[PDB]
Design a protein around this ligand. Structure first.
Ligand code: ZDC
Ligand code: ZDC
Ligand code: ZDC
Ligand code: ZDC
Ligand code: CA
Ligand code: CA
Ligand code: CA
Ligand code: CA
Ligand code: CA
Ligand code: CA
Ligand code: CA
Ligand code: CA
Lengths: 11, 114, 114, 114, 114, 11, 11, 11
């Protein structure tokens, strides 16, 4: 979706 | 390593089908002997078939799948699988962002047909 | 060996797509936890998509593909392939006659979606 | 469907390797153009390499893997996988009994070599 | 995309076997849960088995194959294939140079054992 | 297609 | 272990 | 054979 959205960091 | 390039038997009909799973619009270019033979473009987060066609592998048999989103190439993963020495699948996944689900465009090539 | 049975991760959405390449009408039954979750029926000698749907693998994750022509089960071949430890394809071919091209119904299952 | 038969490129060196996972002694015959090119034999329940050999696919490229235990043919499963359109694996599993783990003899064919 | 990383079922014995096809000495590290479980080393241009070992996937099931030549990491290609929903192969090829045959070290992981 | 039609004999 | 399939022929 | 990628650095 873009910035801030479900990036894939696992935080 | 190079991904998304497959050597088919020459002059053989094959199916190419593209699925979309991303907020971004997927553009799929299917090259046969380094020339565009089909172009798909669509958007879906629900695995929609954005295109499916029968193509001919031509004199060289070289088929290449390219995927881009807003003009930028996606990272590809690919492999070919053969069942009972006859039924062929050439498989492509692509990633257009950061989550690495590699499903943003999924392309399946299958032969023989008919 | 058993063919056309796949263990998916539980409660996971997956795509199932069926292609036809035969003079006979192909009926594809997709079972999830041993119960029919989708049914496709169509005829093509040109690799037409006779059905494509999003299903949920449910509590068991067991997905089974059955193919029949005029009420008689086709012989199946199948395998699962995983790319970059994330992108999954479960692949089925089927033969309804004698020429053993195993493309008469071709079923592709893919996950994850979205 | 037929299993354990693969079409290799002609006159090409390939590796064939067999692993054993069974109480029964495994006998693996590798046929090239219907001639016996290699016979492996061994017993292991710990995946021992019971044989590995470089062979040549000959003018036809036809390679067939047969597995037997005490003279009884095992049920075979097989597929071929190609990575980056270059690296080939022909894979065989086999079942000599009732538990359907299909690992009793496992055979891996790989090419190109060198 | 990441290559050479596979999720195995937890606490499961698996086989790992490495073949060499290169003028350069191949070093293969097999990591389980980021710990070095095995190191293979050898040189062959004839597909020699430079190592084979039974290992345990541990509580996490995370297995990673690394390949290096004289300290330099090789480019990896990989995939996993499952036959009859039971028999698993995790496949790795690697390129240490310029000819892109991706066979310089070939690594096969298979499970279940026994 | 059926009987007599492209059986797959190679004759 | 043992002979495999084909035991328990008969009644 | 030889060192591999990374030869022919420079001019
Ligand atoms: C956002 O643009 C990223 C993008 O779309 C998401 C819905 C998800 O499919 C993600 O995998 C994709 O890269
Ligand atoms: C005839 O019914 C056999 C049948 O249809 C053919 C056109 C061809 O697709 C063949 O593979 C299929 O079994
Ligand atoms: C007995 O011969 C059966 C046989 O050996 C077992 C130890 C186990 O590996 C089983 O899978 C195999 O069929
Ligand atoms: C030289 O080190 C290159 C190397 O060894 C060759 C004999 C050949 O196997 C090549 O593929 C490999 O990269
Ligand atoms: Ca993505
Ligand atoms: Ca996605
Ligand atoms: Ca057919
Ligand atoms: Ca057909
Ligand atoms: Ca067994
Ligand atoms: Ca066994
Ligand atoms: Ca090389
Ligand atoms: Ca090499």
């Amino acid at each position: 979706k873009x910035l801030x959205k479900x990036l894939x960091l696992x935080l | 390593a190079t991904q998304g390039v497959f050597t088919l038997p020459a002059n053989t009909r094959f199916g190419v089908t593209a699925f979309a799973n991303s907020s971004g619009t997927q553009t799929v270019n299917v090259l046969v002997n380094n020339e565009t033979a089909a172009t798909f473009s669509g958007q879906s987060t629900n695995n929609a078939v954005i295109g499916t066609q029968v193509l001919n592998s031509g004199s060289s048999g070289k088929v290449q799948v390219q995927v881009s989103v807003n003009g930028r190439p996606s990272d590809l993963v690919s492999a070919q699988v053969i069942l009972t020495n006859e039924l062929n699948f050439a498989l492509v996944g692509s990633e257009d962002g950061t989550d690495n689900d590699y499903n943003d465009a999924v392309v399946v090539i299958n032969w023989p047909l008919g």
